[model samples]
Target chain A: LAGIVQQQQQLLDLVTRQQELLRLTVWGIKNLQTGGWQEWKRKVDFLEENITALLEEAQIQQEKNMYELQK
Target chain B: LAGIVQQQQQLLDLVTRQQELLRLTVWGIKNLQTGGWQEWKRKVDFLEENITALLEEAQIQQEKNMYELQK
Candidate 1:
């Protein structure tokens, strides 16, 4: 339970990071669409990559925990 | 460590979903306040339903996962 709790906290951290990135992506996409600038698109691309990576990490972690709990 | 990681992932997903719903609600309420339209109220109600359902799902998932890990 303690281990799970700790992991939950870390998961929250990742979620926070992901949300920030998502917000950035949303704003960036909007900016790009509104004839903002080419650089905005580039930034959105970067944010998208980061968000994907975090999502992948979260998925892997969840899988691993489920396996252990089952065991 | 493994269990914790998995729970964290679920938490992240829940948090992410919550954030998105919150954003939608914020926008919906803002629209309603700005005298957007009476129809806007229906949209907000629908959004609240979906968002609340998701939130409940997330909470249940978290609690179930937490128990599984602890045991």
Candidate 2:
């Protein structure tokens, strides 16, 4: 279970990296709009939705796994 | 294990979405560069590296699990 826990941690770190990139992309999108590259706002919005759902599911699974592993 | 497999597939789908967003962001970054935004190129490069490693780890784990389930 220690090995699995470590693996899960690594995966979660990847999720964090992804969240950062998505946020950076959102910022980039808005800045690009500010700089006059007006497009992909909708697509970035979709990516935001997907990342949110993914993060929710990952958190739920991680929580459940921890609960299961506790005892 | 079918349930776990399904869960893994869903996670991989999220990875695919991340890959898409990363690719899209890369495109967006270049266009932003074209439109005169020079920051974040280094950061996007870091994201590309992280995503590639994450995908590789995910693929290996999924393949190993499938092999384990086979026997």
Candidate 3:
């Protein structure tokens, strides 16, 4: 379905973006001696929070349509 | 610290793995017109569930160390 394809696209986009954030997190952690660790930590924390909310919210709507398809 | 580096590495690994799963999801979604969408949906659903639990649990431990550093 067109709707299902859209949902899949969103998930792919989010996970790809999340990978970029995580790469920054790894670099920041390793370079803590350069300072700004706090700011980087905040970024990582923000990423985590956003992921939790977005994944849960997006999947909730997606599953509704998907489960309906199965019935 | 070794601890922080380890944490960062874990996040990197998980995100990398998550990306792979999401790629599969995208492919599966596109191929749904060929049948077996249910199985693919189950795989995507399981990936979402595991990601939720792992990210929450792993970071709950991580933030304690990070927050303590700021004080």
The numbered model that scores best in lDDT is: 2
For A1-71, candidate 2 gives per-residue lDDT tens digits of 43354346556767778788778777776766562333466677787888788888887888888888886
Better of 1 and 3 by DockQ: 1
Over B26-49, each residue of candidate 3 has an lDDT whose tens digit, in order, gives 554445434344564565555555
Best by TM-score: 2
Pitting candidate 2 against candidate 3, the one with the higher lDDT is 2
Candidate 1 ranges with C-alpha deviation above 4 Å:
A1-36, B1-51, B60-71
Residues forming the 10-long window of minimal summed lDDT in candidate 2 chain B: B32-41
Per-model TM-score, in order, reads 0.43, 0.67, 0.34
Q: Kindly report which residue stretches of model 3 are placed more than 4 angstroms away from their true locations once superposed.
A: A2-34, B1-71
Alpha-carbon error at A23 in model 1, in Å?
8.9
For model 1, residues A35-59, the per-residue Cα lDDT tens digits are 4566866876797788778777867
Q: Say which prediction, candidate 1 or candidate 2, comes out ahead on TM-score.
A: 2
Task: Kindly give the stretch of ten consecutive residues in candidate 1 chain A with the minimal lDDT sum.
Answer: A24-33
